[PDB]
Coordinates of C-alpha atoms in Angstrom, one line a residue:
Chain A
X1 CA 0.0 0.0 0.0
X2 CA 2.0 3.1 -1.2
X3 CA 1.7 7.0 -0.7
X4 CA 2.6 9.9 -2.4
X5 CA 5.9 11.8 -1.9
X6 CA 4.8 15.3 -4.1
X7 CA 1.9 16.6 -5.7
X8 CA 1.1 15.4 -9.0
X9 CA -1.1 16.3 -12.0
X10 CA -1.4 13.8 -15.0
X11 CA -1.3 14.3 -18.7
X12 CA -3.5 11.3 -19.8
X13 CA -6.8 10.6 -18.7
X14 CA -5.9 7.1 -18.2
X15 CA -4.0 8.2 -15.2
X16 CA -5.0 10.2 -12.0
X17 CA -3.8 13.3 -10.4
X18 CA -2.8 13.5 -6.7
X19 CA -0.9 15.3 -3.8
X20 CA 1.5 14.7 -1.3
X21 CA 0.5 12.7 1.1
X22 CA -2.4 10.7 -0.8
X23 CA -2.5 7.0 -0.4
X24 CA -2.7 4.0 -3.0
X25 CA -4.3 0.6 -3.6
X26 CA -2.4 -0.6 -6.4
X27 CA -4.4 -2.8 -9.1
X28 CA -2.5 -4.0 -11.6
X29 CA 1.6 -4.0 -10.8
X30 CA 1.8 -6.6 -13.8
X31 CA 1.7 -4.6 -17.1
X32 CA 5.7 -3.2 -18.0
X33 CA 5.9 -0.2 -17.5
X34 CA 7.3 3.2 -15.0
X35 CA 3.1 2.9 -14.3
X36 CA 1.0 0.8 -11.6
X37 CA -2.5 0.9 -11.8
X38 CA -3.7 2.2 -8.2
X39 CA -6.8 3.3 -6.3
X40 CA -6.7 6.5 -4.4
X41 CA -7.3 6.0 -0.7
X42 CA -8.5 10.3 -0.9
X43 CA -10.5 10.3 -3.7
X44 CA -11.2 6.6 -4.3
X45 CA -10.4 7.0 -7.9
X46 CA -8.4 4.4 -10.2
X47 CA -6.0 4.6 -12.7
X48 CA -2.1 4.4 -13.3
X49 CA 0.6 5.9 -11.4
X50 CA 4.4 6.7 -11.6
X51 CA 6.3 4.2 -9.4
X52 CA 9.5 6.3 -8.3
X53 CA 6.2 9.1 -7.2
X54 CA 4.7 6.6 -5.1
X55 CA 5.9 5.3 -1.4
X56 CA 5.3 2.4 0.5
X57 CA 4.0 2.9 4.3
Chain B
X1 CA -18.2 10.9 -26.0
X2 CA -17.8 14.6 -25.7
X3 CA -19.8 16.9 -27.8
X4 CA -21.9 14.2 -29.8
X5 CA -25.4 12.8 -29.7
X6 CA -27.1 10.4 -28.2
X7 CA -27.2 7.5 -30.4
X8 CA -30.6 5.4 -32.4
X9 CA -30.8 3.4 -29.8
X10 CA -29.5 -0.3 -30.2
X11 CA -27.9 1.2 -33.9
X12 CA -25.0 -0.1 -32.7
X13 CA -25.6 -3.7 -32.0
X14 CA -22.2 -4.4 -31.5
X15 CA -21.7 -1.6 -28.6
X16 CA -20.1 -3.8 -25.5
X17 CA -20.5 -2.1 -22.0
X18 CA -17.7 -3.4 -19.6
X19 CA -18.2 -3.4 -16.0
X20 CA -14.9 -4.3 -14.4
X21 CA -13.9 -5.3 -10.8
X22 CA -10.2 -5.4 -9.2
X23 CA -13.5 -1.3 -6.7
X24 CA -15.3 -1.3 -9.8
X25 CA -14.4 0.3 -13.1
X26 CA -16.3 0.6 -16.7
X27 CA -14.9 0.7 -20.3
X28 CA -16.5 -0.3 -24.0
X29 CA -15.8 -2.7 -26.5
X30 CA -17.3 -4.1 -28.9
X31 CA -19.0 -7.5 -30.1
X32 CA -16.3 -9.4 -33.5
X33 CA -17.7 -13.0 -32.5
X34 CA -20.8 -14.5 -30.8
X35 CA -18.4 -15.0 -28.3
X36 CA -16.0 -12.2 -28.4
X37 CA -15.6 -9.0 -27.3
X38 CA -13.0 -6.5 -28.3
X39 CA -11.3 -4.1 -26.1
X40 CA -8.4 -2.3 -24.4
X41 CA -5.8 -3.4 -22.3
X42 CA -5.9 -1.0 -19.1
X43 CA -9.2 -2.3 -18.8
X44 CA -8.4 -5.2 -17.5
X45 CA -9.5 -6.5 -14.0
X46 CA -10.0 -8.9 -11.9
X47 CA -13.3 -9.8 -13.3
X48 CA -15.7 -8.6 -15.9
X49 CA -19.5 -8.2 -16.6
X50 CA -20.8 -7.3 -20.0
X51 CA -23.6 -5.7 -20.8
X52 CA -24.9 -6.0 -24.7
X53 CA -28.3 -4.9 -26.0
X54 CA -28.4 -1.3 -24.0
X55 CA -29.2 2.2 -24.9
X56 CA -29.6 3.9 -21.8
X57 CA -27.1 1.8 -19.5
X58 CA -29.3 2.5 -16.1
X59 CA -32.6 1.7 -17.5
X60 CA -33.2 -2.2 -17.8
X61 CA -34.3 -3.4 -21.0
X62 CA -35.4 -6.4 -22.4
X63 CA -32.8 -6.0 -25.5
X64 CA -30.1 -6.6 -22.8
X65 CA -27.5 -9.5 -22.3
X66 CA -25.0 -9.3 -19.5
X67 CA -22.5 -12.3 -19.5
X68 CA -19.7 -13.2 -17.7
X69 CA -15.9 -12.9 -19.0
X70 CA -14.6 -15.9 -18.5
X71 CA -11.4 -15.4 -20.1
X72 CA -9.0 -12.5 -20.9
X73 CA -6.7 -12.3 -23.4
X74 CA -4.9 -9.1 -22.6
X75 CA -2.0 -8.1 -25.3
X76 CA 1.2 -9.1 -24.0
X77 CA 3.0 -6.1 -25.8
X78 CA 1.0 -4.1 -23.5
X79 CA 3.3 -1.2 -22.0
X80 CA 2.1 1.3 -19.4
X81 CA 4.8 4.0 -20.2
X82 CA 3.8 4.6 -23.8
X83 CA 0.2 3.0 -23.6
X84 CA 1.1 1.1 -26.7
X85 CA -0.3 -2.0 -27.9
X86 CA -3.9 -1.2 -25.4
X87 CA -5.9 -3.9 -27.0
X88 CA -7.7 -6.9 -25.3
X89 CA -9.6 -9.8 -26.3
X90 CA -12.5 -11.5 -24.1
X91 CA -13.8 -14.8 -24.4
X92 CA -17.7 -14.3 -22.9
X93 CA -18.9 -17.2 -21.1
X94 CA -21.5 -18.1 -23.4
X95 CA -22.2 -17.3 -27.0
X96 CA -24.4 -14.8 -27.5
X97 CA -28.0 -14.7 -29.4
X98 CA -28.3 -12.4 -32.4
X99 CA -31.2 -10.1 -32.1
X100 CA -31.8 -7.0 -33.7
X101 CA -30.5 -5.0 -30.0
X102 CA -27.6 -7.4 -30.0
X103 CA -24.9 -7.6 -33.1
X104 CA -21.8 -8.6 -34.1
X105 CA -19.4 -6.5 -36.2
X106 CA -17.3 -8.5 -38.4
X107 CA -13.7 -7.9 -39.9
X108 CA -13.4 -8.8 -43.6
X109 CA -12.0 -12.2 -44.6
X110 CA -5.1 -2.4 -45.3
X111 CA -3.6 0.5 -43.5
X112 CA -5.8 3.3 -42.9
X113 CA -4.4 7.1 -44.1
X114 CA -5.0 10.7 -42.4
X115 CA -8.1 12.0 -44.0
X116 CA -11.0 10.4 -43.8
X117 CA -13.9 10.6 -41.1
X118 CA -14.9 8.2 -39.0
X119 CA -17.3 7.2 -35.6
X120 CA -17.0 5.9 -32.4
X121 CA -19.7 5.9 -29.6
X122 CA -19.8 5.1 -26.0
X123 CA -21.0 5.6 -22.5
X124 CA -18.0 7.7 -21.3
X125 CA -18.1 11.3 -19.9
X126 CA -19.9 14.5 -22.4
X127 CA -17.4 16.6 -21.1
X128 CA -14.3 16.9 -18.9
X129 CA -16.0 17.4 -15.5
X130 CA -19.5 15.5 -16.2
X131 CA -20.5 12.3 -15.6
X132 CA -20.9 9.6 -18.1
X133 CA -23.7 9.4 -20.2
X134 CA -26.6 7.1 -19.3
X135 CA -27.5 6.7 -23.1
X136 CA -24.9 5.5 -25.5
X137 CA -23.9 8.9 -27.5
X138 CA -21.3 9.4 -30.7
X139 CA -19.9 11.3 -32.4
X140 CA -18.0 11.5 -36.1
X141 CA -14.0 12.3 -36.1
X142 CA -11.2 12.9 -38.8
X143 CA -8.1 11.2 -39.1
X144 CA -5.0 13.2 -38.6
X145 CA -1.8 13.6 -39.5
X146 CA -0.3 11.7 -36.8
X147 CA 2.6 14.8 -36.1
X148 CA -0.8 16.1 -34.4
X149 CA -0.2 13.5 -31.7
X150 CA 3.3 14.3 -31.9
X151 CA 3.4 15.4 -28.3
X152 CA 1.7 12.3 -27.0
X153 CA 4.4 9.9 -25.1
X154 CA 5.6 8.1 -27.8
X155 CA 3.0 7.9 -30.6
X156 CA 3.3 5.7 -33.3
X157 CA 2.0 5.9 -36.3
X158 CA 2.3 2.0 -36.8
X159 CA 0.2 1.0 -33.9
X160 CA -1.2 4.3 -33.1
X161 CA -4.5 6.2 -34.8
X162 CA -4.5 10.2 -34.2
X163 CA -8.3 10.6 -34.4
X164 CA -10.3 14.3 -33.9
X165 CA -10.0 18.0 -34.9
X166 CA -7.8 20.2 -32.7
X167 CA -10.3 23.0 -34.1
X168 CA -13.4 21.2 -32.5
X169 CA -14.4 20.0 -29.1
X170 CA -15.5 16.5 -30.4
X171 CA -13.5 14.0 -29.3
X172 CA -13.6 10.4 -27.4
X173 CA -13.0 11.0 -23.0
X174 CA -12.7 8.9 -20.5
X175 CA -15.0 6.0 -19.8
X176 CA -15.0 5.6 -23.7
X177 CA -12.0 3.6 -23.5
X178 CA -12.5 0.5 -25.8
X179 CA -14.9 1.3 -28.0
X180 CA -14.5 0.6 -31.8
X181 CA -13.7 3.4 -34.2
X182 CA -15.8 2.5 -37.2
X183 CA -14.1 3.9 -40.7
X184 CA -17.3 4.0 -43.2
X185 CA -18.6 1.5 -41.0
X186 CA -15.6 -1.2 -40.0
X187 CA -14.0 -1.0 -36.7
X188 CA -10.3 0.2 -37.7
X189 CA -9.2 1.9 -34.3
X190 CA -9.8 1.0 -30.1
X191 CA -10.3 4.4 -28.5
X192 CA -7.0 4.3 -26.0
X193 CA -6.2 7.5 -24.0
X194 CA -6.2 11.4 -24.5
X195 CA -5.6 14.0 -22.7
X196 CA -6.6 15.3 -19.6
X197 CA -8.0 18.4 -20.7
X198 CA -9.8 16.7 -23.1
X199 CA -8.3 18.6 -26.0
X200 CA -7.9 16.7 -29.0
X201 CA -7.5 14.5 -30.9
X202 CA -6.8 11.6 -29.0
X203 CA -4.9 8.2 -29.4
X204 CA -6.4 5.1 -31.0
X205 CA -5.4 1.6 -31.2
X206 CA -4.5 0.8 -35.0
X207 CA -6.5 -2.2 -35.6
X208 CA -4.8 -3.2 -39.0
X209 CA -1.5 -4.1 -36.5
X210 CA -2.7 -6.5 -34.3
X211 CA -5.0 -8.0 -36.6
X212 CA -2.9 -11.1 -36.6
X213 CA -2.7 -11.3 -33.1
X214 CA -6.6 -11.6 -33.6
X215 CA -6.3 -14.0 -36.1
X216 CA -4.6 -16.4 -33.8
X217 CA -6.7 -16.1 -30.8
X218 CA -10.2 -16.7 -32.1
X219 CA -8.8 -19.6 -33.7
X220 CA -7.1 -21.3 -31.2
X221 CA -9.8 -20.9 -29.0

């Protein structure tokens, strides 16, 4: 279960937005690729993610 | 679809609703086989319902046929960086029965150029900060020069389609995501991603490319 380390705003619409501190239920680690697929612990929204943005607890 | 219409309803037999579970999530595709349905890649998920035969996707019809995805063929090319090679195959758990509501859209027993017009229609959000649409809407697109995705994370031509006007609003959003771009009426592109803003046009799986990959599956299954 990771969190966020700085704010973030993405360019695709595949992929969410978020801030520091928000928190992650990653999906789909699977796929190559910098990206996870998550789910917001804040908003409660899915979609892919940077992996060096994202921190584990 | 953002800045369409709301479609004749069940004119688009083929129309797939995906309803996906890891939370839930909801995506299109599209009907090739009795048994088939053809997708996108980040649409994956634990499991799958499909619902075929709808217009409005919150009002229950008798046109309807929800069936369970009982196998997923995701592309193994598939790469979340560059989004490349988003295309799926799902094998439905039980063949489905050819009504009028409920279609199939075959691929003839030919790379498409920048130019012509095309449609793709779907459930997906009318505008950036709305909601999806309850009722299937479309909306008719051009074909681009593919320098007019330039700016997209690695766009290529060869797997890629760069579909919608940057002069107009029309364009495929989020939700949309699977649905079949229909070239004079055969599916030639899988709507992928697009920006955030929702400026177009957006990027769309090349169909001609992984035709083969096609090919294979339906046959050895």
């Amino acid at each position: 279960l990771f969190v966020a380390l700085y704010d973030y705003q993405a360019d695709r619409w595949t992929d969410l937005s978020f801030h520091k501190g928000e928190k992650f239920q990653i999906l789909d680690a699977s796929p190559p690729g910098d990206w996870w697929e998550a789910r917001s612990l804040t908003t409660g929204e899915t979609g892919y993610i940077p992996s060096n943005y994202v921190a584990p607890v | 679809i953002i800045g369409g219409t709301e479609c004749k309803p069940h004119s688009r037999p083929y129309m797939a609703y995906l309803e996906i579970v890891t939370p839930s999530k909801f995506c299109g595709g599209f009907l090739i086989r009795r048994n088939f349905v053809l997708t996108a890649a980040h649409c994956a998920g634990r499991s799958i319902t499909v619902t075929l035969g709808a217009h409005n996707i919150t009002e229950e019809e008798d046109t309807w046929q929800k069936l369970e995805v009982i196998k997923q063929f995701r592309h193994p090319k598939y790469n979340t960086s560059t989004l490349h090679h988003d295309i799926m195959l799902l094998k439905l758990k039980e063949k489905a029965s050819l009504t009028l509501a409920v279609g199939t859209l075959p691929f003839p027993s030919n790379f498409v150029p920048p130019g012509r017009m095309c449609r793709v229609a779907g459930w997906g959000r009318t505008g950036v900060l709305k909601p999806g649409s309850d009722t299937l809407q479309e909306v008719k697109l051009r074909l681009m020069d593919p320098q007019a995705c330039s700016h997209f994370r690695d766009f290529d031509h060869n797997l890629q389609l760069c579909v919608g006007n940057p002069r107009k609003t029309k364009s495929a959003f989020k939700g949309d995501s699977g649905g079949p771009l229909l070239c004079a009426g055969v599916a030639q592109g899988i709507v992928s991603y697009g920006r955030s803003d929702a400026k177009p046009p957006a990027v769309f799986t090349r169909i001609s490319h992984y035709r083969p990959w096609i090919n294979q599956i339906l046959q050895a299954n």
